[PDB]
Ligand binder design. Sequence first.
Ligand SMILES: CCCCCCCCCCCCO[C@@H]1O[C@H](CO)[C@@H](O[C@H]2O[C@H](CO)[C@@H](O)[C@H](O)[C@H]2O)[C@H](O)[C@H]1O
Ligand SMILES: COCCOCCOCCOc1ccc(C(C)(C)CC(C)(C)C)cc1
Ligand SMILES: COCCOCCOCCOc1ccc(C(C)(C)CC(C)(C)C)cc1
Lengths: 68, 54
Amino acid sequence: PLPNAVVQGYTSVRGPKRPLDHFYGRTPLNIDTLWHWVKFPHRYDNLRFAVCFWAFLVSAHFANKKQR
Amino acid sequence: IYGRGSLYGYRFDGEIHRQEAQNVILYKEKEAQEMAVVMEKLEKEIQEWLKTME
Ligand SMILES: CCCCCCCCCCCCO[C@@H]1O[C@H](CO)[C@@H](O[C@H]2O[C@H](CO)[C@@H](O)[C@H](O)[C@H]2O)[C@H](O)[C@H]1O
Ligand SMILES: COCCOCCOCCOc1ccc(C(C)(C)CC(C)(C)C)cc1
Ligand SMILES: COCCOCCOCCOc1ccc(C(C)(C)CC(C)(C)C)cc1
C-alpha cells in the first residue's frame, strides 16, 4: 500500500536523532511528570466535609429567607 | 435548590410580582385621595350639626 521508504521514515539514509536530555541530579519535567509535584488533594479533606456542610446550610438559610 | 424548594429557580420573582408594589403605590394614592374627600365631607357635616345644635 505504502512504500518501504515511507514506512521506515527515510528514502536513502536514516538520519541520526538527537537523544533526549536528562538533567542529572533532578527529576524529569514533562507533561506526564507532574504527579511528583501535584498529588491528589489529601490535606484538607475533613475541612472539605465541614465546609460543604456549612455551605449547604448557609445557602439553604438565605434561599429560604429570600423566598419567604 | 434545597432552600428555595424548587429545582429550577426561585418563585414569586418576575415583573408580574414586582409590579404589585407600583400597583400598591397607585392604590394607596387613590385611597388617600378618596379618603381626604370623604373625611372633609364628614367633617363639614359634623361642623354643621354642631354649629346648628350646640
Ligand atoms: C490501508 C488502506 C489503504 C490506505 C493506506 C494509506 C493510509 C494512510 C493513513 C495512515 C497514515 C500514517 O501516517 C504515518 O505518519 C507517521 C507520523 O506519525 C509517519 O511516521 C514516520 O515519521 C516519523 C517522524 O516524523 C518517524 O519517526 C517514523 O519512523 C516514520 O514512520 C509514518 O511513516 C506514516 O505512515
Ligand atoms: C496558570 O497556572 C499557573 C501555574 O503556575 C505554576 C507554578 O509553578 C511554580 C512552581 O514552583 C515550585 C518550585 C519548587 C518546588 C519544590 C522543589 C519546593 C517542590 C518539591 C519539594 C515538592 C519537589 C515546588 C514548586
Ligand atoms: C497540576 O499542576 C499544575 C502546575 O504544575 C506545576 C508543576 O511545577 C513543577 C515545577 O518544577 C520545578 C521544580 C523546581 C524548580 C527549582 C528551580 C525550584 C529547582 C532547583 C532549585 C533545584 C533548580 C523549578 C521547577
